[PDB]
From Swiss-Prot:
Domain notes for this protein: The SH2 domains mediate the interaction of SYK with the phosphorylated ITAM domains of transmembrane proteins. Some proteins like CLEC1B have a partial ITAM domain (also called hemITAM) containing a single YxxL motif. The interaction with SYK requires CLEC1B homodimerization.
Residues modified as Phosphotyrosine: 24, 43, 127
Disease: Immunodeficiency 82 with systemic inflammation: An autosomal dominant immunologic disorder with onset in early childhood. It is characterized by recurrent infections with various organisms, and multi-organ inflammation that manifests as colitis, hepatitis, arthritis and dermatitis. Patients have a propensity for the development of lymphoma, usually in adulthood. Disease severity is variable.
Modified sites of kind Phosphoserine: 40, 198
Gene: SYK
Chain residue ranges for the region called Interdomain A: 104-163
Domain of life: Eukaryota
Disulphide connectivity of cysteines: none
Location relative to the cell: Cell membrane; Cytoplasm, Cytosol
Modified residues (Phosphothreonine): 252
Record's protein name: Tyrosine-protein kinase SYK
Family: Belongs to the protein kinase superfamily. Tyr protein kinase family. SYK/ZAP-70 subfamily.
Domain SH2: start-end pairs: 11-103, 164-255
Post-translational modification: Ubiquitinated by CBLB after BCR activation; which promotes proteasomal degradation. Autophosphorylated. Phosphorylated on tyrosine residues by LYN following receptors engagement. Phosphorylated on tyrosine residues in response to IL15.
Residue range from the parent sequence: 6 to 263 of 635
Amino acid sequence: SMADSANHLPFFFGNITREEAEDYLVQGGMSDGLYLLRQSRNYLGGFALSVAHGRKAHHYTIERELNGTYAIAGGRTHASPADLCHYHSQESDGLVCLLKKPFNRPQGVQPKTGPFEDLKENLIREYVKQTWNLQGQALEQAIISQKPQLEKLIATTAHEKMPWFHGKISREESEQIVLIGSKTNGKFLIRARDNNGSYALCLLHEGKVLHYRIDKDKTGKLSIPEGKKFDTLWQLVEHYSYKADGLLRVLTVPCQKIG
Ligand SMILES: [Cl-]
């Protein structure tokens, strides 16, 4: 992925929160035009630019366009995040200010990965072995050969393996499974609501199972009603585990699947 390329940038921090990005900018002196790069948490293949100006943090999403280039909303396209940052060191072109000085990862600090990122490589290896039945040669060549296609596919299906995803079960069945055992606030699962890629969130709140529709928009972006848009369910779950953002509370412990 571009994220693997972006690891060679000393000011790329991987998947950190907005708040963690801001903490790093303070560490680096919060000087005008101080910036770092990180991974977009809701745009698949996306990045985010965090910049200090007037002792405030300014955050910009860098989207991966359909042709595979990189752009901030209403901006020009670039071959890479590195090229976008270089361009913005010479032209503000819509940003609050010039990108003056990168804030590098302090020593000890690597780019941060989420749960998806930590199982992505294993799932790609497994899919090649057990759908193209290689055990050597292409086993490794086929992975690198077809990395972009495999990353995109594994991104769209990696939820199916995750402990909070309970598959094609009804509202009534989901309520039954959440209500069994410990009544921990935020206990949750996601279920498939049809075959057209609609989903639902089931969330325990003061002993009541709340149900939230997760709908697919024109682009195939997922959201709860009036909520932030995500490319994948694993992005949505990471977000609402961090910030309630219109849910009555944050997601906590994944509901156990029938063993
Ligand atoms: Cl965030």
